[PDB]
Write an enzyme that holds these catalytic residues in place. Structure first.
Site, PDB file in Angstrom:
ATOM      1  N   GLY A  17       0.759  -1.247   0.000  1.00 47.53           N
ATOM      2  CA  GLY A  17       0.000   0.000   0.000  1.00 47.53           C
ATOM      3  C   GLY A  17       0.784   1.289   0.000  1.00 47.53           C
ATOM      4  O   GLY A  17       1.897   1.344  -0.528  1.00 47.53           O
TER       5      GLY A  17
ATOM      6  N   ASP B  49      -1.646  -3.951  10.622  1.00 47.43           N
ATOM      7  CA  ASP B  49      -1.955  -2.556  10.969  1.00 47.43           C
ATOM      8  C   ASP B  49      -3.178  -2.500  11.887  1.00 47.43           C
ATOM      9  O   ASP B  49      -3.951  -3.463  11.956  1.00 47.43           O
ATOM     10  CB  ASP B  49      -2.093  -1.656   9.747  1.00 47.43           C
TER      11      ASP B  49
ATOM     12  N   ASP C  83      -0.424  13.097  10.525  1.00 43.76           N
ATOM     13  CA  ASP C  83      -1.479  12.337   9.831  1.00 43.76           C
ATOM     14  C   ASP C  83      -1.720  10.966  10.467  1.00 43.76           C
ATOM     15  O   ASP C  83      -1.769   9.949   9.772  1.00 43.76           O
ATOM     16  CB  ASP C  83      -1.150  12.221   8.328  1.00 43.76           C
TER      17      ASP C  83
ATOM     18  N   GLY D 275       4.278   7.994  -1.969  1.00 45.41           N
ATOM     19  CA  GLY D 275       4.961   6.900  -2.651  1.00 45.41           C
ATOM     20  C   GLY D 275       4.196   5.590  -2.710  1.00 45.41           C
ATOM     21  O   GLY D 275       2.962   5.580  -2.755  1.00 45.41           O
ATOM     22  N   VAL D 276       4.936   4.476  -2.800  1.00 43.08           N
ATOM     23  CA  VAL D 276       4.399   3.110  -2.871  1.00 43.08           C
ATOM     24  C   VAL D 276       5.245   2.252  -1.925  1.00 43.08           C
ATOM     25  O   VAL D 276       6.460   2.428  -1.889  1.00 43.08           O
ATOM     26  CB  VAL D 276       4.390   2.535  -4.313  1.00 43.08           C
TER      27      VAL D 276
HETATM   28  C1  LIG Z   1       0.991   3.596   4.594  1.00 39.53           C
HETATM   29  C2  LIG Z   1       1.905   2.491   5.125  1.00 39.53           C
HETATM   30  C3  LIG Z   1       1.844   1.301   4.167  1.00 39.53           C
HETATM   31  C4  LIG Z   1       1.380   2.063   6.499  1.00 39.53           C
HETATM   32  C5  LIG Z   1       3.340   2.994   5.253  1.00 39.53           C
HETATM   33  C6  LIG Z   1       4.129   4.016   4.741  1.00 39.53           C
HETATM   34  N1  LIG Z   1       5.369   3.998   5.338  1.00 39.53           N
HETATM   35  C7  LIG Z   1       5.323   2.965   6.198  1.00 39.53           C
HETATM   36  C8  LIG Z   1       6.318   2.377   7.109  1.00 39.53           C
HETATM   37  S1  LIG Z   1       6.930   0.892   6.299  1.00 39.53           S
HETATM   38  C9  LIG Z   1       6.076  -0.492   6.958  1.00 39.53           C
HETATM   39  C10 LIG Z   1       6.485  -1.430   7.840  1.00 39.53           C
HETATM   40  N2  LIG Z   1       5.684  -2.537   7.988  1.00 39.53           N
HETATM   41  C11 LIG Z   1       4.628  -2.422   7.228  1.00 39.53           C
HETATM   42  N3  LIG Z   1       3.653  -3.394   7.235  1.00 39.53           N
HETATM   43  C12 LIG Z   1       2.466  -3.310   6.569  1.00 39.53           C
HETATM   44  O1  LIG Z   1       2.173  -2.350   5.862  1.00 39.53           O
HETATM   45  C13 LIG Z   1       1.527  -4.456   6.786  1.00 39.53           C
HETATM   46  C14 LIG Z   1       1.633  -5.460   5.624  1.00 39.53           C
HETATM   47  C15 LIG Z   1       0.583  -6.546   5.756  1.00 39.53           C
HETATM   48  N4  LIG Z   1      -0.753  -5.934   5.819  1.00 39.53           N
HETATM   49  C16 LIG Z   1      -0.892  -5.107   7.039  1.00 39.53           C
HETATM   50  C17 LIG Z   1       0.080  -3.948   6.924  1.00 39.53           C
HETATM   51  S2  LIG Z   1       4.540  -0.965   6.284  1.00 39.53           S
HETATM   52  O2  LIG Z   1       4.119   2.325   6.172  1.00 39.53           O
END
Ligand SMILES: CC(C)(C)c1cnc(CSc2cnc(NC(=O)C3CCNCC3)s2)o1
Length: 265
Positions: free
Chosen positions: A11, A70, A111, A14-15
Site C-alpha cells: 500500500g 496494521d 497524519d 509513494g508506494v
Molecule cells: C501507509 C503504510 C503502508 C502504512 C506505510 C508508509 N510507510 C510505512 C512504514 S513501512 C512499513 C512497515 N511494515 C509495514 N507493514 C504493513 O504495511 C503491513 C503489511 C501486511 N498488511 C498489514 C500492513 S509498512 O508504512
C-alpha cells in the site's frame, strides 16, 4: 534498488512493498518515493525503524523494519467482540510514549490514522508514515498553517474513541462535513472555550451554532478515567489540549499492562 527483491505491494508520498534484502537476507518494507537522514536517528520502540535511506538515480527508497499487521485491519478483525480494554490501554499508552519522544525532538506526525499504526505478535504498536479527514484536528481544518504537536494528540484521541466504540468518532467526507461533525458533538467553538478561534483563516461567523453533547453518550462503555483523558485529548484550544507527557501520568494508566493480542497472520 537491485539489492531488493520485491515480494508484494502493501500500500501507501509513494508506494510500499514487502521485500527481501538480497545481501542481509532481511524481510523489510521498501517505500519508493537532510530531513530524511535526520529521521534515521529518531529511534524509539514505538516508532517503525528506518533502517536505510537509498538516494540512487534521482528517486529515493526508504528501507524500514517490517510489521505484519496494521491497527485498521486489527479493529476490523476485532469488530464483533471489540478489542479488550487492557489491550486498548496498552496501545494508547505506547503511542503516547512514541509521541512524547517525537514531540520532545520537535517532530510532528501530522497524519495519524489506524492504517499507519503497525502492530506485532509481541504486543507492540508503532508509529509509521510520518484523503481521510476523520482524524484531522480542528485547527488544521480552520486553516492554521503553524499548528503544533497538539494535532497528534487530537488524532490519537479520535483513534482511542474508535477502538472503544468500534465506530469512527468523526467520519466526515469533506472538510466542512468533518468540521460540522466535530461541532455537532463537541459544540461550535467560540472565544470562551477557544480564544482566537474567530480570527482563524477559515473560521466563518456564519457557521451554525450547535450545543455540546455529554461524553457519556459519545463513548459508552468507557469508564470515567478514560472519558476524562479523552475529553482532555479533544480540547478545542490546542494550548489547553493535554500533552503526550502529561497524558502518560493520567489516572487511566494506573493499571496499564502489556497484553499479547490474538494475531491471525
Ligand atoms: C501507509 C503504510 C503502508 C502504512 C506505510 C508508509 N510507510 C510505512 C512504514 S513501512 C512499513 C512497515 N511494515 C509495514 N507493514 C504493513 O504495511 C503491513 C503489511 C501486511 N498488511 C498489514 C500492513 S509498512 O508504512
Amino acid at each position: 534498488m537491485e539489492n531488493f527483491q520485491k515480494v508484494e505491494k502493501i500500500g501507501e508520498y509513494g508506494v510500499v512493498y514487502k521485500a527481501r534484502n538480497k545481501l542481509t537476507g532481511e524481510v523489510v518494507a521498501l517505500k519508493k518515493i537532510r530531513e530524511i537522514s535526520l529521521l534515521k536517528e529518531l529511534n524509539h520502540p514505538n516508532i517503525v525503524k528506518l533502517l536505510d535511506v537509498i538516494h540512487t538515480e534521482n528517486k529515493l527508497y526508504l528501507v524500514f523494519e517490517f510489521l505484519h499487521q496494521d491497527l485498521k485491519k486489527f479493529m476490523d478483525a476485532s469488530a464483533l467482540t471489540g478489542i479488550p480494554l487492557p489491550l486498548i490501554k496498552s496501545y494508547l499508552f505506547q503511542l503516547l510514549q512514541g509521541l512524547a519522544f517525537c514531540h520532545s525532538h520537535r517532530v510532528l506526525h501530522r497524519d495519524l490514522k489506524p492504517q499507519n499504526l503497525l502492530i506485532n505478535t509481541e504486543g507492540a504498536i508503532k508509529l509509521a508514515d510520518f484523503v481521510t479527514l476523520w482524524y484531522r484536528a480542528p485547527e488544521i481544518l480552520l486553516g492554521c498553517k503553524y499548528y503544533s504537536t497538539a494535532v497528534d494528540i487530537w488524532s490519537l484521541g479520535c483513534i482511542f474513541a474508535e477502538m472503544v466504540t468500534r465506530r469512527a468518532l468523526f467520519p466526515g467526507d469533506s472538510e466542512i462535513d468533518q468540521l460540522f461533525r466535530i461541532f455537532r458533538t463537541l459544540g461550535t467553538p467560540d472565544e470562551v472555550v477557544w480564544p482566537g478561534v474567530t480570527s482563524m483563516p477559515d473560521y466563518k461567523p456564519s457557521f451554525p451554532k450547535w450545543a455540546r453533547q455529554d461524553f457519556s453518550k459519545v463513548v459508552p462503555p468507557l469508564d470515567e478515567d478514560g472519558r476524562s483523558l479523552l475529553s482532555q485529548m479533544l480540547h478545542y484550544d490546542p494550548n489547553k489540549r493535554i500533552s503526550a507527557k502529561a497524558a502518560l501520568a493520567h489516572p487511566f494508566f494506573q493499571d496499564v499492562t502489556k497484553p499479547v493480542p490474538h494475531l491471525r497472520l
